[PDB]
Amino acid sequence: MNIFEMLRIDEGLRLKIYKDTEGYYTIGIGHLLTKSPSLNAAKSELDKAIGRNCNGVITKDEAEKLFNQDVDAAVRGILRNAKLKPVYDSLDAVRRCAAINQVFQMGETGVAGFTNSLRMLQQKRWDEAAVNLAKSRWYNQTPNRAKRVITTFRTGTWDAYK
Ligand SMILES: Cc1cccc(Cl)c1N
Ligand SMILES: [Cl-]
Ligand SMILES: [Cl-]
């Protein structure tokens, strides 16, 4: 298992514009296109990202390209963040995948506000961090997926991804 397969499991793959769990226009492998509710704004963003007139539909290769760029950006985002960087670098490889997953789903922002959890993860207080992580809107809104990520942080293994 690696970050790609893990996220592909958590986000799925769709080739036509769709609304995410929050109701925002998205496409491919969880690539958010816009928070605005104008489908047209979404389509414009799509053409801009892909570089062609898509008309709301892409190919798998295209989706995959977006996914690559998005994984990359997330990691980079982590590394450039001063509150994040240090925690990330203290983790083993599996748990780092769980960190990238959260950033991919919620933005560097959204994460940067899990201060107490971050500290716990940094001190390597696994069970504590897991309980604290669950006390969040994130776990309450997307509990199955949050469960998987939390187990991953808790255990350092891929068991939740089976
Ligand atoms: C989102 C994130 C970035 C870096 C380190 C950690 Cl532990 C987390 N959760
Ligand atoms: Cl792009
Ligand atoms: Cl879920």
Side-chain angles (χ1 to χ4, degrees):
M1 172 100 42
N2 58 59
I3 197 34
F4 293 100
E5 296 166 324
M6 183 194 208
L7 285 152
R8 157 132 195 10
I9 285 166
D10 281 338
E11 299 289 342
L13 164 64
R14 317 235 349 217
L15 302 190
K16 118 122 270 248
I17 287 177
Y18 68 93
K19 288 209 231 204
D20 72 357
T21 61
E22 315 269 332
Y24 299 139
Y25 290 129
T26 302
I27 192 160
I29 297 137
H31 176 83
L32 176 63
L33 288 157
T34 177
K35 296 206 224 139
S36 146
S38 187
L39 172 62
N40 286 281
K43 264 141 150 276
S44 169
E45 279 305 311
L46 179 61
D47 298 325
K48 170 162 58 88
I50 296 307
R52 94 191 158 57
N53 274 68
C54 299
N55 198 28
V57 176
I58 60 188
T59 79
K60 193 193 184 176
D61 286 272
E62 282 172 344
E64 274 172 352
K65 195 149 173 212
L66 299 160
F67 191 31
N68 283 326
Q69 294 172 172
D70 294 340
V71 170
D72 214 48
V75 192
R76 280 179 124 299
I78 278 169
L79 303 167
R80 293 199 255 79
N81 197 306
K83 238 71 242 327
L84 303 189
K85 204 216 173 233
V87 192
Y88 184 79
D89 283 355
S90 65
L91 307 153
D92 56 277
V94 184
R95 300 192 169 76
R96 282 164 188 198
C97 281
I100 299 167
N101 199 303
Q102 257 191 313
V103 175
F104 190 92
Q105 195 191 344
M106 70 204 190
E108 118 208 52
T109 18
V111 213
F114 276 65
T115 290
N116 301 316
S117 302
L118 288 181
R119 346 172 341 255
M120 300 186 205
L121 285 185
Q122 184 175 30
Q123 293 189 119
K124 325 200 163 275
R125 298 173 136 62
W126 317 129
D127 298 13
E128 281 169 74
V131 164
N132 190 266
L133 283 157
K135 310 188 298 167
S136 59
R137 190 202 184 240
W138 173 62
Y139 175 83
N140 286 103
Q141 294 299 124
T142 47
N144 294 333
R145 188 197 178 146
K147 303 179 209 108
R148 281 198 289 276
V149 177
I150 295 175
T151 293
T152 301
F153 277 129
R154 198 174 4 111
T155 67
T157 70
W158 295 106
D159 299 348
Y161 283 82
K162 107 199 117 266

